[PDB]
């Protein structure tokens, strides 16, 4: 016979950061439906003394009436509205018709007792607020109008978000076997799980506004940073420089920039290559160089980006002077497959794992496909592409000892009994490099970043920091467009976090090194903020010539 189910919606879990703050939540309201023509099929039930209280009555008294009326004379009081309206909006034709919108929830619990089920019910609105505005708002994504995530971390986190709607099934016919309004079966409503996230709502506000000032100052197109916990792969901020409101068409139009984005990584790439020169033992990290301003090889000519002499410089020192040249004598016995290997190992070329919508997986091409010339750029950052946190996870390598872990955004569910498991991203741990190959590295980068200490400075603090341009997609009137970038490790003495800042078309005093005075305003911020303990003297710098 006649039956009708009711559904029982699941309410949408919080986003909330590191430290428990609200950053995204659904306003617990309802829609008021009733069903007209079950409405007019109501008979109401007299209270005896075998009903006890599964009978229908208003101030101690039989409804006195049927149907449509008599459903309106039940809802009136609690509804706050006028019967005959009622009574009207239910004398219609169909199975639906609003009765008000915007209940609360007192309200709803309130239309339950009266005895009402499959003939009015209540529709959970998905109005989603996030309290922080425009903050990481593009980051955060948004919800269509079912409440569903469409983008940002609602969508990567949906599942875990929506809950799973419950259920009411109603006998609304007369079957013979129960009398009409009898609720013959229902499920609960598991609603949604929590989500927090390793993100620090104070470092990703600091972030934001660091790259909103270096907007003002130097107007770049577009500046993207990332702050990463080094022992942990820990995110703690995740930036761009646009500016939408969380949750709107905005923002669920494309991911945050700092997630899409792909780029060669320039000479910070060459901190890849190198590790795998000394892991192989192709070279010492002290080894002696004598390097041209120009090479050539099969062919191929190479140059730096700056006329140079017969310069000396060690291995270290080819890192620290960006020297293309160096790289390329320097790698002459290490064979296409290794170049490819070491690159590959720091995670270029593969998922982060994170699950961003809108995250490229980057371009790393095949070793047998490269040809003559590209099979020695890929030694400095050319010819492959990364996208930020790719760039700050195999800088992070050097930083950990040696050790590549999987990045983690999510960092607990808190489920409906209010549990809390922390969440560990798949994939392990992996040592990408000896500890000892680690520890030159992070040395000979402290030398690469003093190069630059005449206008980039944490005061107090060691830095070990790589800086790289590259050629990008033309923009603005400009013939050529470039990215400045630059990645620190902070503090280099007892490594706490990597911060790696780029930024498109930087204007000013500082060009292309623009990207590393904006790493170090970040840095200030953070051992300020985490109350870091200042550097001990450098004692170890291994030499950057000869």
Known sequence: SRTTTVTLKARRGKIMDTNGAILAQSVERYTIIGNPEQAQAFIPTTCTKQTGSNCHQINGKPVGVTGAAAVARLLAPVLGMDATELGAKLSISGQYVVLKKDVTPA????????????????????????????LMGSLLGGVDAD????????????????????????????SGVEIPGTMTESKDAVNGSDVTLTIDRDVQWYTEKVLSDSENKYHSAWGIAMVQDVQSGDILALADSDTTEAGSDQAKMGASRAVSETFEPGSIGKVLAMSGMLQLGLHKIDDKFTVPNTVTVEGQTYKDAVDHGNEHWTLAGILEQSSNVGMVIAGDKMTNEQRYNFISKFGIGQATGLNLPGESEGVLHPSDSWDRRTRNTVLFGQGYTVNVMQLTNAISVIANKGVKKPQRIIKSITDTAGHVEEQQSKGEATRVIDESVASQMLNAMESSAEH?????????????????????????????SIISDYSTIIPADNPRFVITVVLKDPQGSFGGLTAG????????????????????PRTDAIPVNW
Do not use: W
């Open 107 to 134: 309200v709803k619990r309130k239309i339950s007792k009266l005895n009402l089920g499959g003939i009015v019910y209540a529709e959970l609105s998905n109005e989603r607020l996030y309290s922080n505005g425009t």
């Open 452 to 480: 630059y200490n005449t206008f980039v400075k944490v005061d107090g603090y060691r830095m070990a920091a790589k800086s790289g341009t590259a050629e990008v997609a033309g923009a603005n009137g400009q013939l050529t």
């Open 147 to 174: 409440g569903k995530g469409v983008a940002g971390i609602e969508q990567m986190e949906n599942k875990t978000l929506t809950g799973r709607d419950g259920y009411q099934v109603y006998q609304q016919g007369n």
């Open 517 to 536: 005075p904006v790493t170090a305003e970040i840095g200030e911020f953070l051992m300020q903020k985490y109350e870091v303990p200042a550097s001990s």
